[PDB]
Amino acid sequence: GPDETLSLLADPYRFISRQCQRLGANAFESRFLLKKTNCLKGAKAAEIFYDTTRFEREGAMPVAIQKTLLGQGGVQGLDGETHRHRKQMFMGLMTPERVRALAQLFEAEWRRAVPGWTRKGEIVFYDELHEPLTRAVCAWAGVPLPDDEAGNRAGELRALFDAAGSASPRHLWSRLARRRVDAWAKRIIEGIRAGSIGSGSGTAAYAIAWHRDRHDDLLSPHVAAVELVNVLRPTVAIAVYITFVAHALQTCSGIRAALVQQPDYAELFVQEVRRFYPFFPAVVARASQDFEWEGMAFPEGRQVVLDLYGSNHDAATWADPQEFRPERFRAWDEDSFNFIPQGGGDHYLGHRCPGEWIVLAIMKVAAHLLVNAMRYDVPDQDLSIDFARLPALPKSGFVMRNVHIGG
Ligand code: HEM
Ligand SMILES: CC(C)Cc1ccc([C@@H](C)C(=O)O)cc1
Secondary structure (H helix, E strand, C coil): CCCCHHHHHHCCCCHHHHHHHHHCCCEEEEEECCEEEEEEECHHHHHHHCCCCCEECCCCCCHHHHCCCCCCCCHHHCCHHHHHHHHHHHHCCCCHHHHHHHHHHHHHHHHHHHHHHHHHCEEEHHHHHHHHHHHHHHHHHCCCCCHHHHHHHHHHHHHHHHCCCCCCCHHHHHHHHHHHHHHHHHHHHHHHHHCCCCCCCCCHHHHHHHCECCCCCECCHHHHHHHHHHHHHHHHCHHHHHHHHHHHHHHCCCHHHHHHHCCCHHHHHHHHHHHHCCCCCEEEEEECCCEEECCEEECCCCEEEEEHHHHHCCHHHHCCCCCCCHHHHHHCCCCCCCCCECECCCCCCCCCCCCHHHHHHHHHHHHHHHHHCCEEECCCCCCCECCCCCCCCECCCCEEEEEECCC
């Protein structure tokens, strides 16, 4: 078959579901770079993708991603009992109490940032979110962050994910940002271990610095650093979802009113933001043994990609996936495979995002502040979603004018 790396890169979110629609199937064989790849979409495909007797992650992460978005040696590249033991370290962080504490820190940081936004007169909303998130998550995680370094650290964390999937000199900045953030996080881990940094026993940095692997050994300092970044970085990336929350409030009639008046609505709304908007395009794994599924061959070693966006827009599951309708979540049965913006399956037994509770809690804070606290004007701008960008964003970045929180 032809190599279609370029076709995929031009339409990273929609390429798979578009081909699926043309072929009338939920799976097709393709090729990206050197590797024949089976592309999968939908609930049944997600269920097989998360079967760890048939799929492994070892060696599926590209070098370019190790050097930017994810780092080297982290939980994403692990399988089996080694993976599950490392995953438990992240899950232990996510108690209702700790998630609430992070949400509260983020509201405080958002409120702290508003006067700056007022004084600026006009802001790019997306651009302004990274720093308050950075401040909140570092405080929550037990990571010291001097006031005069917060801006710079926020830019470096942003560069790991916002510049990672950019085929421009921005990728070179992403690589440098990765080297810097690893060295910084490593100094944090070392200081905790030496006792020079007093992170509390409940905090992410403490848990990661003192984690013991399956042989009762501490993580090497570089791996501990990478895992700490695996908490800090994607929390800052919630800027993307917060921007989409603002976008939905601006472009979908009746949403603001429903959020204002109906109490149970916020939960439905943030879930629909995660379903509707493109963010994490797709996940990659490798077949661990020969098998056949739905008449498709999966030879041992075959690269397989699971299309998250397409799955979240599958008409078989949702009926009218093209509409933004929070109400649809009244009928959801909490299935582990049919709604997968942050992965599918089980959080402990597979690679599903442990950050979901944090994401939901922070999106709820954002929705609350944007409807009940913030006042802002939205000038004429290009609000259309850039499906060519990784991560996707409204083309304008969501521009606000005359922002205040006292009214
Ligand atoms: C900002 C929005 C976020 C999105 C769209 C997102 C999405 C995802 C996806 C799709 C995966 C991969 C699932 C798989 O490989 O099968 C993942 C994994 C992961 N996420 Fe998130 N996530 C977000 C936020 C967060 C947050 C706030 C945290 C903080 C702890 C986090 C931590 C992780 C970690 C450590 C993994 C690797 C888990 C593993 O491999 O077992 N994520 N996420
Ligand atoms: C770089 C591409 C693959 C898109 C992308 C994936 C994940 C994130 C967040 C959730 C993160 O993990 O930091 C941000 C962007």
